[model samples]
Target chain A: KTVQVTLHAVETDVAYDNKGSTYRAWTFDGKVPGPVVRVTEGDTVEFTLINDKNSKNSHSMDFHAARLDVVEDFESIKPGETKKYTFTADNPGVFFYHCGSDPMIQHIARGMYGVIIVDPKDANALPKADREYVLIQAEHYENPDDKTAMMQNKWSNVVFNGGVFKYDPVHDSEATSWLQAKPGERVRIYFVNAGPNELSSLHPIAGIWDRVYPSGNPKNVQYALQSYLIGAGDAATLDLISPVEGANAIVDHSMRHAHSGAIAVIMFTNDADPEAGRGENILIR
Target chain B: KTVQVTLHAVETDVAYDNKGSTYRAWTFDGKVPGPVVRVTEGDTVEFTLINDKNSKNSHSMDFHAARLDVVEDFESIKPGETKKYTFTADNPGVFFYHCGSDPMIQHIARGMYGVIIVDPKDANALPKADREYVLIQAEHYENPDDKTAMMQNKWSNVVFNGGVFKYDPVHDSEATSWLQAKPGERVRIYFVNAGPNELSSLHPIAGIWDRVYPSGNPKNVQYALQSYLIGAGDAATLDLISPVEGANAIVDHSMRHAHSGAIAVIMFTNDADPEAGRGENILIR
Candidate 1:
């Protein structure tokens, strides 16, 4: 299998709060984190790196999953320049892909990192699941007066995906951003920690992971986990059956991080409504 | 098996930097993290809690491993008072004991938490190690003008054991204060996170954990771990074989925390002279 991914680098001003202070960020595809690239194992990733002319800085990328000659695969591109590279998804796991230009720390701290997921080669490598979601934990250092503070790694917000605990309620509802599942549904989560700093003590409150494929390695699996610890620049695959109904919080368990935006809610519905998308439903069955 | 343990709460002004700043801390036995109490599974903990007469506030305690009616075990004691309680250590693992008085966050954030280790009844329950030590991760929120900020959960420093990074070489240096191991020794650490706020992404730089018992459960283990994430109010037991003959830094992978004092070094000595009191020769082995 061969997959093509196009990632664009652009400079933009972003804000966590609509009325709050905004920071100048160098982003991938106009978002804090670049788009997530998902592919089956053994696939070839045809990646196109494009730098917007409006951006002042040069950029390059490095894939954690690829085994490529650095000289050829990770070449820097100037503004208005484009580069194409290819690499095989040799191993199955969740990996981080981040800007590898000079002063990479500043690039990542300003939000030029994302995830590339290489699925297991064997169809039966992981237990069949009813639903799947991707979550990337990231931190933002908001010391505007001091540019060195960002490089010093002072964090003001530790968020899930790109935003805070709950999604922006104006355009999104719980049904969309908040994880929605049904009782007995197998929920598989591909978790990536882009923590240029903090570690994520990822845990599902009032629940246990039925199976955990650490770092997405099917062979490196654990069962009956109360929580899984993921450090910076690492990833893991977690599987759990949605227990009961109502709300379950997937938190850093490190309450501070949770309070700092490293939290997500999963709302599980009962068998009361199957047709209305509020009951135990299967995607593979 | 019956074991007796005593803890005293005292108020003191502690300095992180010899010349920088000082904060009033409500501590257990006049120290950030009280003390490490080691016991065996099924042992009865005969506990005594005492508050200094000069202390300004009241205090109490709660043990994570004890299974007593909380109403009795967690009762507050006024200044200059004493309370005695008993409970059975029914499980094997690392647990935290902390001040449980009303507004416990202030009590703990000011430094009133410590670790209690219960060894499994089965001698071989966990892997054998030549050396053992205890490391507690905690935070201090220094706000003299406002106690509210501490209650609001703001932190200025996240430290290990008690002090910031290394032992205060000029001011105070004790064999116990510094984590020291020798080459080829298997070191086991009982880690507890008393984070009134931060989660400790505990990791040893340039080292790997031979095995980790997540939350102290022997059954919940991981091998060859680059780091371990211990959340607030949680604990984990880690085993590692000391490598090379140099300084190994144990730090919170969250570099910010490390920068704020959540780091310690384990100095491994070579076989210059095993009889000169520095090598792999253990005191009890």
Candidate 2:
């Protein structure tokens, strides 16, 4: 299982808040969490990293799942240049791929990170799941003129996926943005903490993780976990059963993070079946 | 075993940062992280809560370890009032005691939280350790005019034992504040997260937790963990061996929190025995 991944590193000035607090964000494929790269164990990843000409900074990546010398695999690509490296995914797990450039913290703090998930090749490697989601936890410091604020580790926001409170009432009107799930369904979440500095205490408000793969390794599974910790540049894979039907919160469990933006609501609803009185064109009661 | 413990809720102006930023903190015993109360499982605790007249708000407490009707046990105590209750510590674990007043989050955010430890009655309850310490993780929003900032979940500092970076070089120039331990000695940490909001992703930079007693329960021990997650109002007990003779960091793993305050260092050193070639009065080699 060898595949080519061309990752374009884009550096842009982006506003982090409604008040126009902006930051210089270095991104992969033009987004905060880049993109999710999925492969099987023993797979080879040929990464071609392209630094945008408009960028002011050099960029590179180091994959947690790869068994290569970081110096060789994570060599820097200067602005307007490109570099390539190959590495085998020797371990099965969820891994973080992030910029490994000098002042690496600044690169990741800005947004140069993504998730690379390597599934086990062997049968029964993981329990079957009905749905899956990739959640990358990240932080942002919204001081446009103060890079030292970021270096000093001051965060204005800690978010899930990319934006703050994406599923909260303050952001999602009409409840359309809530994550959807069916009762009795098995949902697998690949969680990545791209914290240039913080740890993510990932937990579902009303559900327990039926299985947790620490560092994404199936061999290191833990059962019935109330919460899981994902450190900076680390990842975890969790399996959970959609608890009862209704809206439930998926939070960093660090309440401050939840209040900041690391919160999402999953609505567990029944299927629209004619027999269940929830089919198309059903009249309002 | 029966014991009497009195906790006083007081409100006073206090500085949460080194910059002289002050806020009216509601505290137990006039300080953030009130105080540690240690008891044995099966012990009966008679708790008296007093609210100082200087306080503007009413306060109450909810003990995470006590098995009681929260509605009754956590009844509010108005300013200038006192209330008492008694409960048996049926479970052995590390638990948080915090203000349970309405807008409870605000109460805790203002520094009204503490730790309670219940040791098991049975022998072989927990692993033996040569040294023990209590580490409380908490946050301060630090906006003088905006209580909304706390409501909005913005934190300026996340501290260990109520102060920022107490053991870091910047703070402990004379190196007197760093936690001390003997090389190869077993150390136990009673960790409490008084998170009015954030989860604590506690980790040791150069060592692993030899055993993690989630919520301080012996039955819930986890072995050989790199880090542990403790939700707001949650607790965990960790055992570790001083791996080497040097200064090592114990941080929130969330770099932002570490930079803010939730970071400490422990100095492990050789003893002054003739066999170890180290002495208390010996200057230099």
Candidate 3:
């Protein structure tokens, strides 16, 4: 099987969060997350990159889902330049693909990344889900011009889908971007931590994961973990069912990260404050 | 089976790290970590707390391993006051016990916390280890006078066992607290995150864990993980073998925390740069 995909490396000014802080960011197809390139095992990806002629810096592509010659395929392209490469999705997993430019930390921190999904040849290799969505966690600095903070990995906030309280109804009342699903439905999330830095202890406040495929690989499936840790540039496929009819927030649960804009609600009924489970006073006796 | 544990709550000036930056710390038994109360499952702990006569504030105890009445058992004791309670270690796991006083965060931040190890009734419930050690990670602030920063969870540093770089030979050359063991020995680390804030991505450089008992419980054993996340007031039993004759650094792996001084070396031969395995360029193809 063969497929053709094209991406445009464009640098543009965009807001980093719901608060409307702006940053001059490098992106693919003019967005924080370029786009999702989905395919099944054995499919070959004929990829092309067209750097915007007016771009301020050179940019390149690096596909974690593909096995290729780094020197040949991952070479950087100057402004207005174009390059092409081919890769076969021999493995089935959710992987990250991002700009492989000089000072990758800066490129990524400026928003040049996205996820690619490779489904197994046998669709049943992993369990099916009633709903599926992609969520990427990344760091953001309100002061767009601060390279020192980025170099030190001191992000103003770590956010989901590039926005502060973008999906938290309780925090940002203007947040209309929360995940919605019917109660009892098995919701699957393809989560990628596009961190130039930071760790994520992903968990749902009022719920638990039924299954988690670390690195988005079925071979590494784990059951019923309270919270799973995902590192920078790493990915996971989490499956869980909303047992009750209410809103639940999925967060980095490490309260520090949670407090730092890494929270969003999963709405079923959207009625109560689903800070659900426990408190600091666990009374663990 | 029965055991008696006596502790004294004392407030005194102490250095928060290897650099000797002092803080007016609230401690138990006059140390950051009060003490470890180790016992087998089915053992009853007769616990007593004596607040130092010169102390300025009240103190109390809350054990994560024991199940008991909270209001009666966890009631605070004023200066010079003594309180006693009974706890049965019915569940075998590593758990945290901290001061559950007004503004629990401030109390625990001052270091009134420690770990309690409850061994399972069956000796073989968990595998044996050639070496065993306890390591607790906690947040620290050098300016002990700043309660505002503590309330905001902005710690000056996140450290291991109350000291920054206290065990890192490379970064802290004078570090004398590194772990030591012969090559090929299985090291069992009892890790607790006493975070009044922050999460720990516990991982060892140049190494992988053979077994990780989350919450130190045999029931939740996970095999061969790259990094595991432990939350505030949480603990895990990590077992790994030193396969070679070289030093390995154990860090929060989240570089931010690593940079904040949450690191130490597990020395075997200590001859090489144990940044061992990989670099940012994983070349994942």
Candidate 4:
């Protein structure tokens, strides 16, 4: 069966980073990041891009995973215009998909990117994990129309999932996310650096990465690392297991941005059994 | 057989990133980065650290490649003091070696680090690379005495091998370093990140990393990565082969640090026959 996906490229304003701050986000489907489109390799994708009638400026799509022609498939569309295309998901890995319009950095800085996962056709391609999580790290500037700041690398905030400290299950006084799991259970994190600029130096406090799939592809794996780097617009899959109880923090390692909200904690609970799993990933906000 | 090396912990003023800027560098030798200590795995490193009588502050040593009791070997030596020890290089990989003095971050930020490469005991451990190179990525501050600024992550410059654009054989207005190789020759680069903070997202321009050996350990390798991350105080070995003759730039992919002097260019010459090779690595100022 063919997989059909639709996304609306719209200019939506949203509360981002620190509280009391609003960002004029050029989003896909009304969010900083559009939506994650997951498809198995060999599956045909019927994709449609709908630029909102209420939006200003042009929008387009560039799937790092796709082999489509740019001029034919990724042409920029004026506001209120729409485009459609179909292609087979032939590659397997986590790929960044973003607006391919001119002033691309500006579009991404204003939040116009997301991820698409092309799963391997083989059932056992990736080992199943007890817990799975999705994180998209990005930078936000104060002004959406400010082209100067982005080029100057004068970013206001660098964050994950559009909010600063949004996923800190351990430190945030009032954490708005549940990045929880049972101790000793295997956890896999799919991380994408949606950086228009800046690289991500990801680290786990008092923890080690047992395995790392550079492109979120199981075929390409490295083992036992103290830290890993996810560059802007790059992705990686990290597998780790906390042997003991309590909460462990994941940070940007630099300890600089880690204070600027590039951190999240996975709280380990001893009250659950492996048989009673919460699902491969828990994303309830 | 044993390999003996003596390093003098000295404070010297040197020209750093920008023109006319002199940094009061706390070094293990006369240079910003101490000499590279390379030994075959299992070779005994008969090491001696001599703190210069003129040095204003205390200094010490901490080698990531060494597995020694901290109390026994890494104790801080006061000015005008000297110490000696011996350790068999049991590990085979690229590692960062730095000062273990108090206010450790400052010791690093002010320039007290270098890299050590322990080649594998087995000749076949790593593939035969036609060319080999060395790079140590580090940060510097304009005000070496400013502790508050460092804690604030207000870095003055992020550089490779001591200076900004030092190895940029391509676009540097006044190139000072030569990292040359023949076209289509397999090149192996030993890299170390001596970050007291910050991660390195290393990338190649108009090129690809055929294999990446994290920690410079061939036993742990990743392949065909467009960009690779090297966390603070970490290391990696990258193998790349340029098919054509041109100037290829190596950079910190964030494109951020790449601007702050975290860049180098590998000039490929089509004129030479790889057989008349220019040693494993070519480093000349």
For every prediction, compared with the true complex, DockQ reads 0.11, 0.11, 0.10, 0.11
Q: Per-candidate TM-score, first chain only?
A: 0.87, 0.88, 0.92, 0.93
Instruction: Show pairs that collide, candidate 1.
Output: none
lDDT by residue for model 3 (A162-264), tens: 7777778766776656676667777788898999887787866445566788878887776654457788989998886755565566777455566678887
User: How big is the positional error of residue A61 in model 2, measured in Å on the Cα after superposition?
Assistant: 2.4
Any idea what lDDT model 1 has? Answer: 0.72
Q: What fraction of the reference structure's interface contacts does model 4 contain?
A: 0.19
How well is each residue in A89-123 modelled by candidate 1, as lDDT tens digits? 88998888888887766777777888787878898
Q: Which of 2 and 4 is ahead in TM-score? A: 4
Docking class of 2: incorrect
Off by over 4 Å in 4: A1-92, A95-108, A111-135, A144-191, A196-212, A221-233, A237-285, B18-20, B169-172, B243-248, B272-285
- Winner by lDDT between candidate 4 and candidate 1: 4
Candidate 4 structure quality by residue, lDDT tens digits, B204-244: 65455778888887778777565677889999999977755
Candidate 3 RMSD to the real structure = 10.6
Instruction: Quote the lDDT for A192 in model 4.
Output: 83
> Top model by lDDT, which number?
4
For candidate 3, write residues B1-285 as lDDT tens digits.
889999999998876666577778899888776677788988989999999899999999877665443445677899989999876775677777788776566787788878887888999998876666678888886566566676567887888877778778789776656676667767788888877677888998999999998767787788999898797656788987877888778899879889989997877864422332123111000
Q: What is the lDDT of residue A129 in candidate 4?
A: 77
Q: Distance (Å) between predicted and true CA of A219, model 1?
A: 2.8
Clashes of 4: 1
User: TM-score of every model?
Assistant: 0.62, 0.60, 0.63, 0.66
